[PDB]
Amino acid sequence: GNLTPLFEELLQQCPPGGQNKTAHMVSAYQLAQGNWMPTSCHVFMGTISARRTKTHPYEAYVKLRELVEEHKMKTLCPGSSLGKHNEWIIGKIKYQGNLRTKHMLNPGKVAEQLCREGHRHNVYNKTIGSVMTATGIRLEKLPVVRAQTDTTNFHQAIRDKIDKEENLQTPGLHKKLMEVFNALKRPELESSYDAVEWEELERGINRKGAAGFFERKNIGEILDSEKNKVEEIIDNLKKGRNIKYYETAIPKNEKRDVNDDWTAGDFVEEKKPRVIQYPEAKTRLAITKVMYKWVKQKPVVIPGYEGKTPLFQIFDKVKKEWDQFQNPVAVSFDTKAWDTQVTTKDLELIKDIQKYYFKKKWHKFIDTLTMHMSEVPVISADGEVYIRKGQRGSGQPDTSAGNSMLNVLTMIYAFCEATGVPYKSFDRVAKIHVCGDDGFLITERALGEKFASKGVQILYEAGKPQKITEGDKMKVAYQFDDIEFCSHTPIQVRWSDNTSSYMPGRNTTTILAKMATRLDSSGERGTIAYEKAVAFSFLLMYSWNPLIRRICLLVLSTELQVKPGKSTTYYYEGDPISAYKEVIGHNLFDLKRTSFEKLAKLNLSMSVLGAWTRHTSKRLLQDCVNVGVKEGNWLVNADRLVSSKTGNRYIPGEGHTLQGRHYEELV
Numbered sequence: 001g002n003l004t005p006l007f008e009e010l011l012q013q014c015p016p017g018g019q020n021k022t023a024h025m026v027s028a029y030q031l032a033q034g035n036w037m038p039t040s041c042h043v044f045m046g047t048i049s050a051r052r053t054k055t056h057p058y059e060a061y062v063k064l065r066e067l068v069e070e071h072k073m074k075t076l077c078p079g080s081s082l083g084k085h086n087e088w089i090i091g092k093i094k095y096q097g098n099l100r101t102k103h104m105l106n107p108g109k110v111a112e113q114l115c116r117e118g119h120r121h122n123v124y125n126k127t128i129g130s131v132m133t134a135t136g137i138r139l140e141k142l143p144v145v146r147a148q149t150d151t152t153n154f155h156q157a158i159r160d161k162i163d164k165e166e167n168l169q170t171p172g173l174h175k176k177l178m179e180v181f182n183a184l185k186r187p188e189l190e191s192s193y194d195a196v197e198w199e200e201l202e203r204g205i206n207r208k209g210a211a212g213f214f215e216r217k218n219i220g221e222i223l224d225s226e227k228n229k230v231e232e233i234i235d236n237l238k239k240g241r242n243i244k245y246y247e248t249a250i251p252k253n254e255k256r257d258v259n260d261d262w263t264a265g266d267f268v269e270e271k272k273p274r275v276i277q278y279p280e281a282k283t284r285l286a287i288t289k290v291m292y293k294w295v296k297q298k299p300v301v302i303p304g305y306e307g308k309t310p311l312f313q314i315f316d317k318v319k320k321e322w323d324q325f326q327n328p329v330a331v332s333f334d335t336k337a338w339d340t341q342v343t344t345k346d347l348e349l350i351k352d353i354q355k356y357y358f359k360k361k362w363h364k365f366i367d368t369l370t371m372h373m374s375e376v377p378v379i380s381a382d383g384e385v386y387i388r389k390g391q392r393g394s395g396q397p398d399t400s401a402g403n404s405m406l407n408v409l410t411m412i413y414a415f416c417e418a419t420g421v422p423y424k425s426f427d428r429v430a431k432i433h434v435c436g437d438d439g440f441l442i443t444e445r446a447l448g449e450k451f452a453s454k455g456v457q458i459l460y461e462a463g464k465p466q467k468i469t470e471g472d473k474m475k476v477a478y479q480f481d482d483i484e485f486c487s488h489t490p491i492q493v494r495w496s497d498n499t500s501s502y503m504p505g506r507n508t509t510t511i512l513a514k515m516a517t518r519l520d521s522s523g524e525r526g527t528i529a530y531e532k533a534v535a536f537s538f539l540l541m542y543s544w545n546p547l548i549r550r551i552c553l554l555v556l557s558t559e560l561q562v563k564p565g566k567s568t569t570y571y572y573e574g575d576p577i578s579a580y581k582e583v584i585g586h587n588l589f590d591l592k593r594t595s596f597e598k599l600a601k602l603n604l605s606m607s608v609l610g611a612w613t614r615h616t617s618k619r620l621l622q623d624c625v626n627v628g629v630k631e632g633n634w635l636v637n638a639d640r641l642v643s644s645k646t647g648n649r650y651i652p653g654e655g656h657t658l659q660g661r662h663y664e665e666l667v
Contacts, residue, residue, distance in 0.1 A: 001032040003057050008046075008457070008472055010061070013068045016461040017042030018171040023049035031060045041067035044170065045417065046457035078165055080105040082375075082387055085242045089377040089385060092214075099155060099384050101163045109383040110213070116382070119270070120146045120253065123518045127531045131554050132516060135620045136613035143262040143609060144513035147273040149251040151382045157251065157272045158386070166343040166390045167463035174349045177409045180416075180423045181353055184303050184408075193358040195234075196292040198227060201285070204663060212280035213248045213379040219281050226282065233286040237365045245372035247393045249277045249380040255517055257510050263608045277378055277388070278395020287397045290365055294354055295397045301357065302405050304432040304439070306486075308665045312540050312584065315483075315490040315502035321431045321442055322480050329448035330440045330483045331455070332475040333411055335464045338403065338437030342392040343463055344374045349409070350402045403436045410462050411441060418454035419447050435486055440477075452476045481505075481598055491602070492595040493544045495586050496640075503544045505598060509605045511538070511548050524565035532556055533564040533571040533660075539580060540570055540657070544594045545602075546641070547612075550620045553636045557627060566660040577638050578655030583666055588638040589650070621645070 007028035207220030251273030430443035491505030535555035
């Protein structure tokens with residue numbers, strides 16, 4: 001009836017309960033339509049037990065609201081204990097605590113020092129910047145802000161996100177998730193994973209990887225001296241012996257996009273930090289050395305895992321899936337603060353999966369580590385200790401693998417339970433794609449809409465509450481380029497071939513913001529070299545954007561004799577226009593037309609926020625043309641329009657795309 005959305009809202013507040021085969025279980029719609037009187041607020045698949053009695057919708061509503069409030073009353077005052085294996089941390093406490101934490105224990109402080117403050121304003125790449133501002137782009141106006149890392153806001157962040165009990169989850173959920181796992185295990189690899197050699201582990205490793213609160217040496221330093229310390233940790237865990245597990249909590253210093261805020265009118269100028277929580281460097285080494293093939297997905301055993309797919313390939317890959325369905329539709333995964341939603345039972349389910357794949361000799365390792373992870377003492381940067389109840393800390397080696405598996409398992413479960421499709425038959429009916437907590441699913445419109453409705457409830461009960469659209473549903477893409485994934489959305493280009501591919505689209509404002517700014521000045525981060533590598537990396541992602549493309553081209557044109565740096569995501573070797581060709585599969589020159597409407601939308605905010613002038617495009621074009629009319633071979637002539645107007649072309653020499661960081665698998 002009229003009141004269905006209200007009942008939906010209330011069912012998102014009830015405690016998850018189990019099946020009840022012996023009672024009249026009824027849904028929000030049912031309650032809203034009439035003569036059902038709630039008896040429980042224990043909710044199961046969006047349904048609660050009700051008597052069949054003359055009852056008006058408003059009356060049923062009042063009753064359920066009363067039941068929910070009663071439960072909330074039973075539930076204040078829950079208590080936070082500290083398990084014996086964590087008692088060691090108290091020995092290090094020296095002052096009393098000031099976290100004012102409400103749901104986890106805050107025994108006190110260790111040092112009283114680092115009670116930092118300040119702002120952190122934006123740092124600018126000189127060359128990139130002058131290319132942009134010489135055309136009327138104003139860096140000031142780009143909706144990018146910094147993460148306030150002062151202790152006050154840092155604590156506010158902790159209380160905001162991490163101070164919370166483990167989510168209640170539907171009884172027997174994890175039995176069910178293991179059934180889902182069972183339909184996608186790889187028997188081919190049971191009991192097979194073993195540790196790796198320091199050789200392998202070090203290859204590509206980040207030697208600047210940071211140290212724990214009680215830790216003087218970073219990853220490089222540990223590798224040079226204390227491999228024996230690390231091997232000791234490995235042996236303790238290997239045997240079942242507790243270790244002094246703890247995690248360090250620092251506010252993540254980063255650039256924060258505020259495009260949507262500024263265009264609304266709300267002109268936010270700082271944002272509360274995300275919270276990084278990571279174990280000791282010695283301990284990250286100890287975990288990764290043993291669990292390398294799981295934590296790094298070597299091989300990938302998580303269906304839909306896209307951790308290893310380059311961003312410029314993903315959408316093309318996905319469109320091949322979209323094209324196989326009669327009325328394709330994509331339901332978007334969007335869990336609120338995923339990391340803070342992960343419960344001990346979740347961690348345990350990953351523990352059991354890990355034990356499926358690892359050799360028996362390491363089971364006791366996994367057990368002991370999983371246990372440590374279920375109640376984690378965390379020292380903040382400024383000294384405050386808090387005892388986290390479950391959850392996930394971003395710095396954990398298992399973060400990316402664990403989350404992704406957990407996300408897939410949960411979303412399949414939810415999809416199936418919403419639709420009727422058995423867990424074994426998921427492959428028959430939909431396609432899934434996860435990168436950590438991010439992801440989506442592709443399926444037939446009927447099943448996708450079912451999922452998008454029954455999903456918010458089911459996922460709430462599963463312990464992974466969503467974020468929703470005005471219709472209180474999961475976000476649904478009815479046309480391919482409305483998919484959103486890894487902060488991007490597909491945009492179509494058409495080549496001189498007359499073929500077409502999809503590239504990773506994103507607001508122009510955000511692209512310029514990210515491209516113009518930098519965090520440090522350490523590594524190659526001062527030089528033109530680093531800027532050329534940034535331009536190349538952007539050119540791989542954003543060649544569909546004539547503005548970004550032309551800016552990148554002009555940057556790559558600067559100081560021809562200077563080889564690019566290796567710090568950023570991708571870099572190049574030889575000629576960047578070729579490298580482009582090598583991994584995009586056409587030449588820049590072939591890019592005939594970018595999809596008009598999607599490009600207009602991703603450009604819109606630029607005008608709304610006054611980040612460019614009426615003549616910016618024109619001026620940037622002219623800037624390219626002035627370089628490209630000169631006699632000779634000028635890489636700005638790789639731009640189809642530039643070349644058209646200069647009457648010259650660019651003849652690329654040899655070149656190859658390379659990687660300096662994350663580590664993916666190119667085609």
